[PDB]
Structure formats: C-alpha cells, structure tokens
Design a protein around this ligand. Structure first.
Ligand SMILES: CC(/C=C/C=C(C)/C=C/C=C(C)/C=C/[C@H](CCC(C)(C)O)C(C)(C)O)=C\C=C\C=C(C)\C=C\C=C(C)\C=C\C=C(C)\C=C\[C@H](CCC(C)(C)O)C(C)(C)O
Ligand SMILES: CC(/C=C/C=C(C)/C=C/C=C(C)/C=C/[C@H](CCC(C)(C)O)C(C)(C)O)=C\C=C\C=C(C)\C=C\C=C(C)\C=C\C=C(C)\C=C\[C@H](CCC(C)(C)O)C(C)(C)O
Ligand SMILES: CCCCCCCCCO[C@@H]1O[C@H](CO)[C@@H](O)[C@H](O)[C@H]1O
Ligand SMILES: CCCCCCCCCO[C@@H]1O[C@H](CO)[C@@H](O)[C@H](O)[C@H]1O
Ligand SMILES: CCCCCCCCCO[C@@H]1O[C@H](CO)[C@@H](O)[C@H](O)[C@H]1O
Ligand SMILES: CCCCCCCCCO[C@@H]1O[C@H](CO)[C@@H](O)[C@H](O)[C@H]1O
Ligand SMILES: *C/C=C(C)/C=C/C=C(C)/C=C/C1=C(C)CCCC1(C)C
Ligand SMILES: *C/C=C(C)/C=C/C=C(C)/C=C/C1=C(C)CCCC1(C)C
Ligand SMILES: *C/C=C(C)/C=C/C=C(C)/C=C/C1=C(C)CCCC1(C)C
Lengths: 260, 260, 261
C-alpha cells in the first residue's frame, strides 16, 4: 500500500526523474504563453481552430506531467515471470517494496494530446472528415492499448500482445500521415509546411514504441530514470517545437488555411 | 479498507448529506420527465438537437448523484500536512477512520454535464464550430484538473496548483460566454434569452470554485455536509431551473433557432 | 488481495470461461482481416466512413476481450444482502475468496463499440446529425449506467435502480432504430438492407439486459462462466456477423450510400 506522498517524494530525491518531469511542466507553461501571444493576430475561424487545437497540446502536457510529478498518476507494479524487470525492488517510505515505479500517467498525456496534434495536422492538410475520424479513433486505440500493456502484470506474453495491437493501430495513423494527408495538403496549398511537420511527427512518434521496448516496460535496458528522460525529450520535439513550427507558419499564412 | 456499503450508509443516517443527494436524484428524475414532455412538440432538427443536449444535463445528473448516493463514486482521503483538514476522522461504519469523505463523483457529473450545457448555449447563440470546440475542451480540462486537485494528497500546494490550472481554464470558458457568444446571439436573434442564461450561468458557475475553496477540499470552513448542500443548491439552479428556462424559450422560439 | 495474475489463471483452467474469452479474441482478429480485405476497393468518403466505423467494432472487441482474458478488467466483488449471489466463493490463488468474479470489462467493450454500430447504421439510413447524436449519447449512457449497476455492491436495490435507468436510455436507442431510421432509410434508398440489419440489431441487443437479469449480476440462475458464454454468443452475432452482413452490402452498393459526409 504505497501512498501518493511516498511516490511524490520518490520522484524527488531522484535526479533524472524529477528533472525530466518538472522541466516539461515548465516548458509546457512557457509554450502556452508563447503560443497565445503568437496567435493573438488570428481572425479566421478555421485558422483559429488549428491554433486552439495546437495550444491544447502543451495544455494537456502541463496538466498531465503535473499528474505524474504529484504522484497521482503513478503506481508500483510487479512485472510477471519472465519480464526483465520482474524481481526489481524500490525504496518507498521507510521500506523496500517489490515492483517497478510505473508512470502510467504518460498514456493519458498521449491519449488526450495526440488527437489534438492529429486534428491540427489534418485540418492543415485539408483532410475530409473520414480521414480525421479514422486517424483519431485509431490513434486513441493505440494509446489506450499501450496503457493496457503497461498495466498488465498477469502475463509477460500478454503485455507484448497488447503492444502488437497498439503497433497495428499506429500503422493506420502512419499511413494517413504519410500517404493520405500528404496528398490532401497539395490541394490545400500547404504541401511544404505539411511535409516538414509530417517528417518531424513520423520520426518522433516512431521513437515512442522504441523507448517502450527498451525501457522498463519492455526489456529494461533503460532504467526507469532513462526511460522517462527518453520520453520527455521526445515530447519536447513532438509537442513543443512541432507546435511552434506549425504556429509559426499559421501566423504568417492565415490566408492559405482560411477555408471551410 | 472502507467499503462502498459503509460510505452508502454514511450518506444515509446523515440527514444533511443524504437530503442533498437523494433530493437531486428525485429532482433530476422529475426534470427529465418534464423536459421530455415539454419538448414533445418540436419538429425542427436543429431545435431538437438543442433540446436533447439540454435533456442530457439532468440525465447525467441523476446517474452521477446515484453514483455518489450509492457510494460508488465516494472515497476517504487523508489530506496532506498543512491542509486545514489534515488529521480529520470520519468513523466509517462504527470505527474511527482517518481522512475526509471525498465525493469525487461530483467532478464526473461536471465533466459530462457542463459540455452539454455549453453545447446547447453555444448553438442557441449561433456559435461557429471553433468557439464551441474552444469552450467545451477547456471546460472539460477545467473539470478534470479540478478532479485531480481533490484527488491529490501528496502535497498541499499541489492541490492549489491544480486549482490554479483549473481556474485558468475557467476564465477561457467565461470569456466565450460573456464576450464571444454575447455578440453571436445578436446575429442569431437570441440575444435577449442568452442574456438571462448567460448571467445565471456565470453567477452560478462562479459559485463552484468558491464553494470548493471554502469546503473540505479547500480551506475547510464548511463541513462535509454543508459543502455538499452548497453544491446541490448550485446544481439545482445551474442545471434544472437553467435547463427549464432554456427549454421553455426553445419551445417558444423553435422557428428562430432553426435558422431557415 | 486478489492479483491480476490469479484472475488470469482462474480464467485459464476454467474451460467455459477461457473459451468464451479466447474464441472472441480470435474471431475478432479474423473479422478485422476479413473486413479490411472486403472493403479494399472502396473510394467514396461517405462509404469509407461507414466501413471504418464498422471495422472499429471488432478492433474494440479484440482489445477489450484481451482486457478480460488478461485479468486487467476483471475484479472480485461481494454482492449485497438479498442479492441471489451473496455469500458466493471463488477459490483464487490458493484460498477461498468471498465474492463473484466480475467481468466488468465487458461494459467497456460495449460503451466503445455500440456507438460505432449505431454510427454505421445511422449513416446507412441517411440519418441527420440530431438523431445520430441522440442515439450515440443515450447508448453510451446506457452502457455506463450498466457498468455502474454491476460495480455497485452497497445496496441490492441500488443495483436494480441503475439497471432501470439503463433500460430507459435503451428505449431511446430502440425508438430511433425502430421508428426514426426505419423511415429515413426509405428516403436514403437503403430500406431493404437497413430494415434487415436494424431488426437483427434490435433482437440481439434485447438479449443483453435479459442475460444481465438472468446472469450472476442479476438473479444468478446463470453462473459466471455461463453468463460469460451467453454474452460472448450475443457478441458474435451482434458484432462480427452483423458487421459482415453490413459490409457485404456496402461493398456491392457503394454508389447508393456514396452521397457526402
Ligand atoms: C431515468 C428516468 C428517465 C429517463 C428518460 C429518458 C432517457 C427520456 C429521453 C427522451 C428523449 C431523448 C426524447 C427525445 C425528443 C427528440 C427525439 C429524436 C431526435 C431522437 O427524434 C425531444 C424533443 C428532445 O423530447 C427517470 C426517472
Ligand atoms: C490486431 C490485428 C489487426 C489490426 C488491423 C488494423 C488496425 C487494420 C486497420 C485498417 C484500416 C483502418 C483500413 C482502412 C481503409 C480506409 C483508410 C484510408 C483510405 C484513409 O487509407 C479501408 C478501405 C476501410 O480498408 C489483428 C490480429
Ligand atoms: C429511487 C432510488 C433511491 C435508492 C434508495 C435505496 C435505499 C435502500 C436502503 O436499504 C437499506 O440499507 C441499509 C444500509 O446498508 C441496510 O442495512 C438495510 O437492510 C437496507 O434495507
Ligand atoms: C491471443 C492472445 C495470446 C495470449 C495467450 C496467453 C496464454 C499464455 C499462458 O502462459 C502460461 O500461463 C501459466 C499460468 O499463469 C504459467 O504458469 C506459464 O508459465 C505461462 O507460460
Ligand atoms: C423490474 C425490475 C425490478 C427490480 C426489483 C428490485 C428489488 C430488490 C430489492 O432488494 C432488497 O431490498 C430490501 C429493502 O431495501 C433490502 O432489505 C434487501 O436486503 C434487498 O435485497
Ligand atoms: C427483471 C428481473 C427482476 C428483478 C428481480 C429482483 C428481485 C430480488 C428479490 O430477492 C429477494 O428480496 C427480499 C426482500 O424484498 C429478500 O428478503 C430475499 O431474501 C431476496 O431473495
Ligand atoms: C505528445 C505525445 C506523443 C506525440 C506520443 C506519441 C506516442 C506514440 C506514437 C506511441 C506508440 C506506442 C506503440 C505504437 C506501441 C505500444 C506502446 C506505445 C504506447 C509507446
Ligand atoms: C452541473 C454542473 C456545473 C454547472 C458545474 C460547474 C463547475 C465549475 C464552474 C467548476 C469549477 C472549478 C474551478 C474553476 C477550480 C477548481 C475546482 C472546480 C472544479 C470546483
Ligand atoms: C457489442 C455489444 C453489444 C451489441 C452490446 C449491447 C448491450 C446492451 C443493449 C446492453 C443493455 C443493458 C440494459 C438495457 C440494462 C442494464 C444492463 C445492460 C448494460 C446489459
């Protein structure tokens, strides 16, 4: 029975963990201010939709990272027989506790933020509703199944079956980004900025399942602290700079996206 | 350790607490039967959409209040060091239990009912998709971060940080109600009814973050039973009477709200 | 003190229970491959929306059934006084545990998939946004209040009160399916197929609250393993075959539903 307080103190006293988390909370807040200021000029409703959708990314990120830092969305789980992190221990409170400190809260960051990124990119590319619906539903399925994998402690094999379903959903999102929206952006007159954001999104997103497989959730070659910093670095690019690049464009081309 | 039945019994056997819960269950139930009856004559689809979104308010309310009354959405939390309610006891059942009875279920009632209130009001004001999206998203963020605040026990200051984040989201919603949709109602031809509903909402909505701060979750000047009734009083106005007013107007201005 | 592993193992070792779960994981997966293959030639965006909504049904189902088989969305609950399943035991890990193995994960399978079934049927019927919004919101309310009913252990009466609220939400869905969309399909040119799929849906959907009342969650004439197969059988028809029938039509009549999103 680990308390939220003990997990909160655990993040603290842990150099890599505390920094990877609190640094994103600060970068998330600064992004919001920068983005709100960068977009005060917008007037086109559609251009503003792309703007707000994008601003929600760091908004979800600051709130979600606070969920982790606070200890609210953190748990200690025991990995099943065969798992490379099975048998691990953690010092919480005044005793050694079996298990791994699991930052499941990240999956909430992803479930709520990724759809916004997709909504922004889809609108930017001039996507019809079918593709937006397809990309977003499967993106959500990808995040939720990823969370289920991280939460499964009954069977090592089951954790990886979850991982495989999540990857299949990932592929659907990738196909829309790489093939469908790439084409739609041409008709939208945003093919250039879309290619840039598209490349950045694909490379960064491909990084998450890699970190998962290598971190404590996977084969654990990366300690709980390094797994967290890997994710945090990826978020900075996939979220904060991605958002800046998109907004930097929008604010100079409000006329191009001003449609229906 | 505390069972659901023990919380269910705690609510009963306590006139204040129970009355603030079972009364809203009955009032909600009656409001549904009344709202459905009231709108049975509607024929326009857009008008019908506003009525259903409004009818969902008391639907979500009766379900959520049942969640609280049954003990399903209630928990016992120990406040952090420095919290005005630290070191409290409850006596769940017949044993003295440390902590405070936390009715976190109210937040779900809010995260699900407020978007419906906003959707109805936005449509009534002739709002475009951009503003509805902005209003609803930040509103949900408001409710979720508010829930996170109540559920945080690791730090006293963390709770207020959540509270601060939620207030920021609250201001975004308020701005759209007061400034944005105020102008939209004009062109939509519902400027006069929106005024009454706008005021009512902004005044009633301001009561929640105030009650929070004064109740057990906040500085704790109001006992658990008084906070409950404070919220229930607010729910009765911001939901039932507010919904009756909106519906009464809608049924009288179906033609106007339909557009063409 | 019941762990996810103990529940995972309880399912395994229980022939009825393991089969009701793993068979659907397999049929859901085969359904997805079959459905993606069937709809490969679609081009119209409205036709494709109907296809994706339908395909999402077995996608949700495979994930959620894995949730159940893994033990992630299963818990042990003790029924309230007067409940026909009160005082039951389950034997987990090694000792006897009071309560009933509660597969609440099924409600998540429902709350996420039923909306897709409705979206697909609504579009097939040429429904306007109002009825679609009304059908989907009350359907979700139906699934959520149902989950609350199963999760309620404090009062036997409260359990059935949640059940009644859920039924009322169900009546809204049924009304839209039987009265509203039945007429819209005529104007959409999809009466024949819609009426068929609507009827198949209504009959199967009616099966769920009946199983709930007869199963371990209700009067318990059906033990845990049997209530599970009752639900798994309903799912096979209401999801996999229903979706297969709907896609069979879609892929031979793209032009009829082509219209515009
Ligand atoms: C639990 C309980 C009562 C539950 C009542 C319910 C669930 C009734 C819902 C009715 C609806 C949604 C009616 C729809 C109409 C529109 C119909 C449509 C668009 C579908 O054609 C309209 C004009 C808005 O009244 C009581 C205690
Ligand atoms: C786990 C597992 C299987 C998972 C399978 C997945 C996730 C497949 C998804 C396919 C999609 C979404 C196809 C979309 C097309 C439309 C898309 C578009 C035109 C936009 O590319 C269309 C015409 C409907 O097939 C098996 C065991
Ligand atoms: C309109 C829906 C409102 C639901 C009202 C439910 C109230 C039922 C209370 O029942 C009683 O609860 C006590 C405490 O658990 C038991 O000791 C007692 O034996 C049982 O009879
Ligand atoms: C389609 C989804 C595929 C998942 C199939 C899950 C079945 C794997 C069961 O594994 C076995 O479970 C036993 C009891 O827990 C262990 O004693 C044993 O060592 C382990 O190997
Ligand atoms: C068409 C659906 C009909 C639903 C009928 C539900 C009735 C369930 C009543 O339960 C009983 O209520 C008593 C008084 O509250 C408790 O003392 C007792 O312990 C409890 O078991
Ligand atoms: C649609 C399905 C119909 C729901 C039927 C549920 C009613 C359950 C009745 O149970 C009985 O209630 C008595 C109190 O009233 C208890 O004294 C008795 O021990 C208990 O067995
Ligand atoms: C702000 C967060 C972003 C952009 C997150 C992106 C996350 C993914 C692309 C995650 C994908 C995963 C899989 C495909 C497999 C299983 C594990 C996950 C959840 C890490
Ligand atoms: C039916 C329910 C209604 C109209 C609820 C409204 C709720 C609010 C305006 C809540 C606001 C809050 C904050 C601004 C700060 C933190 C705590 C909350 C959640 C009480
Ligand atoms: C894929 C799943 C399907 C088609 C599920 C359908 C479920 C229902 C129609 C459930 C209805 C219920 C009630 C009306 C009352 C309370 C209990 C439920 C949840 C079983």
């Amino acid at each position: 029975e680990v308390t939220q307080r003990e997990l909160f103190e655990f993040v603290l006293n842990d150099p890599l963990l505390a920094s990877s988390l609190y640094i994103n909370i600060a970068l998330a807040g600064l992004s919001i201010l920068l983005f709100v200021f960068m977009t005060r000029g917008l007037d086109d409703p559609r251009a503003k939709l792309i703007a707000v959708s994008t601003i929600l990314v760091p908004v979800v990120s600051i709130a979600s990272y606070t969920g982790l830092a606070s200890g609210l969305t953190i748990s200690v789980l025991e990995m099943p027989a065969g798992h490379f992190a099975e048998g691990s221990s953690v010092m919480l409170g005044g005793e050694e506790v079996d298990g791994v400190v699991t930052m499941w809260g990240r999956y909430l960051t992803w479930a709520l933020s990724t759809p916004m990124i997709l909504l922004a990119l889809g609108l930017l590319a001039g996507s019809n509703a079918t593709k937006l619906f397809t990309a977003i539903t499967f993106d959500i399925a990808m995040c939720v199944t990823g969370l289920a994998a991280a939460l499964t402690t009954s069977s090592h094999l089951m954790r990886w079956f979850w991982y495989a379903i999540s990857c299949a959903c990932f592929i659907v999102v990738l196909y829309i980004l790489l093939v469908e929206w790439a084409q739609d952006a041409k008709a939208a007159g945003t093919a250039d900025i879309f290619s840039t954001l598209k490349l950045l999104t694909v490379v960064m997103w491909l990084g998450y399942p890699i970190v998962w497989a290598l971190g404590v959730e996977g084969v654990a070659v990366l300690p709980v602290g390094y797994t967290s910093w890997a994710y945090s670095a990826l978020d900075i690019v996939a979220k904060y700079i991605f958002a800046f690049l998109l907004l930097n464009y929008l604010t100079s081309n409000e006329g191009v996206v001003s449609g229906s």
